[PDB]
Structures are given as C-alpha cells and as structure tokens.
C-alpha cells in the first residue's frame, strides 16, 4: 500500500511548487530523456509520465520491456525527482506532469559504456519515430512535428574524453536540446565527462544546510539538492539517496519547466545558451542569473553559478 504524498526538501529548495499553477511540465511538445538504468515503468507515482521506454545496452536498441525495466533503482529514483506525479501518494518531481523517455544506457550495476551512452543520446534525438528532423526544417527540439526530447539528463560520468561521445553531444546541442550531467562523485577539482563539455550543464550537489557535498566534483556550472534525496525506487516504492546523480534531475526538471512555460506562452522554446551565459535570452543564461548565488559572488568552483530556482527562472523566462 502507498504512502501519502510528501514534498522532498530538494523540490522545495529549487522553488518548483510555485511554478505548477503556470505549468507542471505537461506541454505536449516537451519531453525529458533520462539516460539511466531504466525505470520501474508500472510505478504508481511514475506510470502516467513514461512516454517511451528504450534500451541501448550492448549496442542493441530495444523497446522491449524485459530490456527497458530498471534492474537497479538508480534510474527510477532519478526519474522520480524530475517527474513523480502530483497526486495523493509517494513524492512529487520538479516537473510532475512532464513526459519522460526512459533511455536505458546503464546496466543492473549502475555502470555503463560510452558507446551505449552515445547511442542513447542519438535515440533521445531521434525519438520513437527513429527520425531526427521529420519535415527537414532544421527545428528538432521544440518542433511539435518531431518527437525529440528538449532535455537530456545524464546522472553518469567518466574520466575519458572521446570525439564519438563529443560529436554526439554536439548533435544534441545543435538539435536545440538542453544537456544536463552530474559533475561526478570523486571530490575532484573538475567535472567528469560528459558534464565537462561546454555544450553540457555540469551539476554539483548541495546538502540540506546549503553546503556543497564533499564528494561533489568541483567547477560545476550549477548546483542542486543531492544529499538525503527522497524519491521513487523499485518495486513500486521509495528510497533516500545522495550523489550528483540526485542533483542532476532537479536541474533537468527546472529546465523542462522553463521550456514548457516558454512554449505555452510563445509557441517556441528558448535557445540552449552557453556555459558563460548571463543573458535572459537562453535557458542557460536564465539558469545562471536566477540561481541562488552561494559562496564567493558569481560563479565559484564549489556551487558554480549557484543553486537553480525554478520559480525565478520561469518568472524571468516569461518576463
């Protein structure tokens, strides 16, 4: 039997609930692709937002449920942080009405290969129809005629850089898609890849006293709740975890909210923007200037621009 709904502190922290009266993310053209261990697809607090379930493990693309299910819990938890439903049970995500493409690129261990991950990105871009730009107009993310995700969320990272992974990230960036990745968990001076690419938002982790977590790789672009994160977990349950894997979906939920609220108002999505951005004209510029500036002023190596805040980002986007 299911617990009554609670709002995990991290959702409160990124100022999501005050957005939901404008949008919960449930604007038709918007999808979030979660590249992870898969998803507990019948989870009562997730089922209704899972729009597509793909797997790329071992180089072999599969839409079979045996293949797409979460055998770990890591992807179920992450996904619940973006998109657990706003109802009577369990938890609630940053964007509790957004459609999710669960793209299974990590195995039963929470570990995955670069080549499966790169296939995963291509699949997020292609969407279930297996075509990127179906009408050949150049618009992919935000084109309601295509089925590309507008957000790619990667709670994974590794120390190695390759041009095949790098070129896939340029493809997603050029497709107009916001890429979000965990900075990593080694307490290192800089982020893991792909978080470290200029096309990708590197996300670091804070705890409930707003301190940066000791394990969070430094030099992120933004930071988010990532210690003591309650979310969904198999089978049809809940668990509390820590890591930059937990911080990353908070930032992807905020992005979905921006793009969903902007589309709803303007019938187009915002451009992605740059790692440097401080304008109000791109998703990343808005994320930077509306982040809660913790530590030294402006960008710092612990928190990056600061803790992302949906309620101000969205106000700024519609401003």
């Amino acid at each position: 039997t299911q617990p009554a709904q609670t709002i995990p502190w991290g959702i409160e922290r990124v100022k999501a609930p005050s957005v939901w009266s404008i949008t919960d993310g449930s604007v038709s053209v918007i999808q979030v692709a979660v590249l992870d261990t898969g998803v507990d697809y019948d989870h009562p607090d997730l089922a209704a937002n899972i729009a597509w379930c793909v797997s790329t493990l071992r180089g072999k693309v599969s839409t079979k449920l045996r293949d797409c299910a979460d055998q770990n819990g890591h992807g179920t938890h992450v996904i619940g942080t973006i998109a657990a439903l706003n109802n009577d049970i369990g938890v609630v995500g940053v964007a509790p009405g957004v459609q999710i493409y669960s793209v299974r690129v990590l195995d039963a261990r929470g570990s995955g290969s670069y080549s499966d991950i790169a296939i995963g990105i291509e699949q997020a871009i292609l969407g279930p129809d297996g075509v990127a730009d179906k009408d050949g107009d150049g618009i992919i993310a935000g084109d309601p005629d295509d089925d590309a995700a507008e957000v790619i969320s990667m709670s994974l990272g590794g120390p190695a850089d390759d041009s095949y992974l790098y070129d896939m990230i340029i493809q997603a960036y050029n497709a107009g898609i916001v890429i979000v990745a965990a900075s990593g968990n080694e307490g290192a001076p800089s982020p893991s890849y792909p978080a470290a690419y200029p096309e990708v938002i590197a996300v670091g982790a804070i705890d409930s006293n707003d301190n940066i977590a000791s394990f969070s790789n430094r030099q992120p672009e933004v930071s988010a709740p990532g210690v003591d994160i309650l979310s969904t977990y198999p089978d049809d349950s809940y668990e509390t975890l820590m890591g930059t894997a937990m911080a990353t979906p908070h930032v992807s939920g905020v992005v979905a909210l921006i793009q969903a609220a902007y589309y709803q108002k303007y019938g187009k999505i915002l451009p992605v923007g740059t790692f440097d951005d401080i304008s109000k004209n791109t998703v990343r510029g808005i994320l930077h200037i509306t982040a809660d500036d913790l530590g030294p002023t402006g960008w710092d190596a612990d928190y990056g621009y600061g803790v992302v805040r949906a309620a101000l980002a969205v106000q700024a986007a519609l401003g």
Binding site: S113, Y114, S115, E122, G157, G158, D162, Y164
Partner: protein, 63 residues
C-alpha cells in the same frame, strides 16, 4: 574481443569489410559518421589502416 568506435569516411569505408580482419559491426550511428565494432584485440592495428577508417577510439565505462 575488444569493442571500439570507428570514426569513418562514408565514401571510403565498408561495414561489410571489417570481417576481413576478424571484426563485426555492432551499431552504425545515424547522426555521426561512426560505427561501434567488435574486433580481435590484435586487429586494432590492422583496423587502423582499413580504408575509410579515420579514427579508432576505445570504449570506456561510466558509473
């Protein structure tokens, strides 16, 4: 066998010919000119000189 990712010149490279060096194709990317291939550990040098092969990269694991 090891699994590598070959950056290719579309108009020089033949996926059917990696069999020549003991290889087979795993996945051909649609959006990037690259192909995931499985090959004998000692064929990497041969693979590197195959026609249409521009770069051979190795696979890595992420947590």
């Amino acid at each position: 066998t090891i699994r590598v990712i070959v950056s290719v010149d579309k108009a020089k490279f033949n996926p059917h010919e990696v069999l020549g060096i003991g290889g087979h194709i795993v996945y051909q990317f649609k959006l990037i000119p690259a192909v995931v291939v499985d090959v004998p550990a000692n064929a990497v040098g041969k693979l590197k000189k195959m026609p249409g092969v521009e770069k051979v990269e190795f696979d890595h694991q992420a947590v």
